[PDB]
Amino acid sequence: GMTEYKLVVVGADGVGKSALTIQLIQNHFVDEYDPTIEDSYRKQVVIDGETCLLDILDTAGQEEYSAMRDQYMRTGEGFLCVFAINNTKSFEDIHHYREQIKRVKDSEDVPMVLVGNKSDLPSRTVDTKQAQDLARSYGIPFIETSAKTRQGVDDAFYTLVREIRKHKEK
Ligand SMILES: CCN(c1nc(OC[C@@]23CCCN2C[C@H](F)C3)nc2c(F)c(-c3ccc(F)c4sc(N)c(C#N)c34)c(C(F)(F)F)cc12)[C@H]1CCN(C(=O)OC)C1
Ligand SMILES: Nc1nc2c(ncn2[C@@H]2O[C@H](COP(=O)(O)OP(=O)(O)O)[C@@H](O)[C@H]2O)c(=O)[nH]1
Ligand SMILES: [Mg+2]
């Protein structure tokens, strides 16, 4: 049947993980979505001619490392590591999220895409060049998005799917 891809959106509180997921599916920008709601969403799309089903986990809640939390994140096939272009701390927190993904997946190679969100704001504090070069050192794609305007939203999620299937052919 149809290929299902399990996507997990990770990143600091307030970078726009919920706003990105809601934009991808409903095509609307939500200004205040409950920071505490973690939920799975579903969308069927065509990526490079393949019809597939996305199973997107929009993460929220507390940092905790129980066995059950670990195993849950371990079911994810690829990860959107989201920072905000106006929050340097959310960008420097990226190393941490990638390290946790690598730990539970028990692999140095895990399908991932780096997402710099809020590209519509005029006062950035992380340069594209800086994030591009970090992304290049990880060997992963980098995409700047806006959940306000939709710029880059489809490309971010679709490129993660590409990374997963390029990792499956191994
Ligand atoms: C949404 C929950 N969350 C998370 N915060 C943090 O760290 C927050 C900071 C702030 C200083 C202390 N700490 C360390 C670092 F300095 C950054 N790390 C998280 C994290 F690593 C994951 C994770 C990812 C991939 C995986 F394979 C696994 S496996 C497993 N057991 C995970 C866990 N947990 C996990 C997740 C998860 F699961 F949802 F994806 C959520 C995390 C909130 C807490 C408040 N936040 C914030 O931004 O506060 C300003 C973000
Ligand atoms: N201007 C702008 N604001 C955004 C963008 N994405 C999210 N936001 C806002 O940032 C705040 C937190 O976003 P949210 O989706 O809840 O982030 P989350 O905690 O990672 O799920 C909210 O006020 C959103 O409306 C964006 O691309 N541009
Ligand atoms: Mg949220």
mmCIF file with all atom_site columns, N, CA, C and O and ligand atoms in Angstrom, residues 13-14 16-19 33-38 58-60, ligand 3:
data_model
loop_
_atom_site.group_PDB
_atom_site.id
_atom_site.type_symbol
_atom_site.label_atom_id
_atom_site.label_alt_id
_atom_site.label_comp_id
_atom_site.label_asym_id
_atom_site.label_entity_id
_atom_site.label_seq_id
_atom_site.pdbx_PDB_ins_code
_atom_site.Cartn_x
_atom_site.Cartn_y
_atom_site.Cartn_z
_atom_site.occupancy
_atom_site.B_iso_or_equiv
_atom_site.pdbx_formal_charge
_atom_site.auth_seq_id
_atom_site.auth_comp_id
_atom_site.auth_asym_id
_atom_site.auth_atom_id
_atom_site.pdbx_PDB_model_num
ATOM   1  N  N  . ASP A 1 13 ? 10.975 25.543 22.695 1.00 0.00 ? 13 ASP A N  1
ATOM   2  C  CA . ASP A 1 13 ? 9.665  26.159 22.851 1.00 0.00 ? 13 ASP A CA 1
ATOM   3  C  C  . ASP A 1 13 ? 9.642  27.502 22.136 1.00 0.00 ? 13 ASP A C  1
ATOM   4  O  O  . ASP A 1 13 ? 10.589 28.282 22.233 1.00 0.00 ? 13 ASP A O  1
ATOM   5  N  N  . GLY A 1 14 ? 8.573  27.752 21.384 1.00 0.00 ? 14 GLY A N  1
ATOM   6  C  CA . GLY A 1 14 ? 8.367  29.045 20.771 1.00 0.00 ? 14 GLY A CA 1
ATOM   7  C  C  . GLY A 1 14 ? 9.074  29.284 19.453 1.00 0.00 ? 14 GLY A C  1
ATOM   8  O  O  . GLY A 1 14 ? 8.996  30.405 18.933 1.00 0.00 ? 14 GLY A O  1
ATOM   9  N  N  . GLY A 1 16 ? 8.198  27.828 16.698 1.00 0.00 ? 16 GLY A N  1
ATOM   10 C  CA . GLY A 1 16 ? 7.190  27.716 15.662 1.00 0.00 ? 16 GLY A CA 1
ATOM   11 C  C  . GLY A 1 16 ? 6.877  26.302 15.208 1.00 0.00 ? 16 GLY A C  1
ATOM   12 O  O  . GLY A 1 16 ? 6.426  26.109 14.081 1.00 0.00 ? 16 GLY A O  1
ATOM   13 N  N  . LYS A 1 17 ? 7.089  25.302 16.068 1.00 0.00 ? 17 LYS A N  1
ATOM   14 C  CA . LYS A 1 17 ? 6.846  23.917 15.663 1.00 0.00 ? 17 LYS A CA 1
ATOM   15 C  C  . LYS A 1 17 ? 5.366  23.674 15.386 1.00 0.00 ? 17 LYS A C  1
ATOM   16 O  O  . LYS A 1 17 ? 5.005  23.066 14.372 1.00 0.00 ? 17 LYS A O  1
ATOM   17 N  N  . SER A 1 18 ? 4.495  24.136 16.282 1.00 0.00 ? 18 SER A N  1
ATOM   18 C  CA . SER A 1 18 ? 3.064  23.979 16.063 1.00 0.00 ? 18 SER A CA 1
ATOM   19 C  C  . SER A 1 18 ? 2.592  24.818 14.888 1.00 0.00 ? 18 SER A C  1
ATOM   20 O  O  . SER A 1 18 ? 1.800  24.349 14.065 1.00 0.00 ? 18 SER A O  1
ATOM   21 N  N  . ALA A 1 19 ? 3.064  26.062 14.794 1.00 0.00 ? 19 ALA A N  1
ATOM   22 C  CA . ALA A 1 19 ? 2.643  26.929 13.700 1.00 0.00 ? 19 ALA A CA 1
ATOM   23 C  C  . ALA A 1 19 ? 3.066  26.364 12.351 1.00 0.00 ? 19 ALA A C  1
ATOM   24 O  O  . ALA A 1 19 ? 2.337  26.500 11.363 1.00 0.00 ? 19 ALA A O  1
ATOM   25 N  N  . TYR A 1 33 ? -0.962 29.183 19.674 1.00 0.00 ? 33 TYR A N  1
ATOM   26 C  CA . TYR A 1 33 ? -1.330 27.797 19.912 1.00 0.00 ? 33 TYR A CA 1
ATOM   27 C  C  . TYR A 1 33 ? -0.689 27.318 21.208 1.00 0.00 ? 33 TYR A C  1
ATOM   28 O  O  . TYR A 1 33 ? 0.521  27.478 21.394 1.00 0.00 ? 33 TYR A O  1
ATOM   29 N  N  . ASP A 1 34 ? -1.518 26.738 22.104 1.00 0.00 ? 34 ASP A N  1
ATOM   30 C  CA . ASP A 1 34 ? -1.158 26.210 23.421 1.00 0.00 ? 34 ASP A CA 1
ATOM   31 C  C  . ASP A 1 34 ? 0.236  25.598 23.390 1.00 0.00 ? 34 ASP A C  1
ATOM   32 O  O  . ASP A 1 34 ? 0.445  24.561 22.747 1.00 0.00 ? 34 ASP A O  1
ATOM   33 N  N  . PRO A 1 35 ? 1.214  26.213 24.062 1.00 0.00 ? 35 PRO A N  1
ATOM   34 C  CA . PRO A 1 35 ? 2.595  25.698 23.989 1.00 0.00 ? 35 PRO A CA 1
ATOM   35 C  C  . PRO A 1 35 ? 2.751  24.289 24.539 1.00 0.00 ? 35 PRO A C  1
ATOM   36 O  O  . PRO A 1 35 ? 3.798  23.671 24.308 1.00 0.00 ? 35 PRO A O  1
ATOM   37 N  N  . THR A 1 36 ? 1.749  23.767 25.241 1.00 0.00 ? 36 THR A N  1
ATOM   38 C  CA . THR A 1 36 ? 1.854  22.521 25.985 1.00 0.00 ? 36 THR A CA 1
ATOM   39 C  C  . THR A 1 36 ? 1.240  21.331 25.266 1.00 0.00 ? 36 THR A C  1
ATOM   40 O  O  . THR A 1 36 ? 1.327  20.212 25.775 1.00 0.00 ? 36 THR A O  1
ATOM   41 N  N  . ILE A 1 37 ? 0.623  21.539 24.110 1.00 0.00 ? 37 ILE A N  1
ATOM   42 C  CA . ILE A 1 37 ? -0.097 20.477 23.418 1.00 0.00 ? 37 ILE A CA 1
ATOM   43 C  C  . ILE A 1 37 ? 0.855  19.760 22.470 1.00 0.00 ? 37 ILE A C  1
ATOM   44 O  O  . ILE A 1 37 ? 1.384  20.360 21.529 1.00 0.00 ? 37 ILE A O  1
ATOM   45 N  N  . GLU A 1 38 ? 1.077  18.479 22.727 1.00 0.00 ? 38 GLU A N  1
ATOM   46 C  CA . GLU A 1 38 ? 1.789  17.598 21.818 1.00 0.00 ? 38 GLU A CA 1
ATOM   47 C  C  . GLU A 1 38 ? 0.770  16.700 21.137 1.00 0.00 ? 38 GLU A C  1
ATOM   48 O  O  . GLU A 1 38 ? -0.085 16.112 21.803 1.00 0.00 ? 38 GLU A O  1
ATOM   49 N  N  . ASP A 1 58 ? 4.171  16.745 16.505 1.00 0.00 ? 58 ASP A N  1
ATOM   50 C  CA . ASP A 1 58 ? 4.504  18.104 16.914 1.00 0.00 ? 58 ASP A CA 1
ATOM   51 C  C  . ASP A 1 58 ? 4.737  18.093 18.421 1.00 0.00 ? 58 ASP A C  1
ATOM   52 O  O  . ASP A 1 58 ? 3.785  17.982 19.200 1.00 0.00 ? 58 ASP A O  1
ATOM   53 N  N  . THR A 1 59 ? 6.003  18.192 18.827 1.00 0.00 ? 59 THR A N  1
ATOM   54 C  CA . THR A 1 59 ? 6.389  17.893 20.201 1.00 0.00 ? 59 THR A CA 1
ATOM   55 C  C  . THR A 1 59 ? 6.153  19.075 21.137 1.00 0.00 ? 59 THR A C  1
ATOM   56 O  O  . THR A 1 59 ? 6.258  20.242 20.748 1.00 0.00 ? 59 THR A O  1
ATOM   57 N  N  . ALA A 1 60 ? 5.843  18.749 22.391 1.00 0.00 ? 60 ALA A N  1
ATOM   58 C  CA . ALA A 1 60 ? 5.628  19.739 23.436 1.00 0.00 ? 60 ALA A CA 1
ATOM   59 C  C  . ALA A 1 60 ? 5.715  19.048 24.787 1.00 0.00 ? 60 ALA A C  1
ATOM   60 O  O  . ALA A 1 60 ? 5.636  17.821 24.880 1.00 0.00 ? 60 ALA A O  1
HETATM 61 MG MG . MG  B 2 .  ? 3.739  23.917 20.092 1.00 0.00 ? 3  MG  B MG 1
#
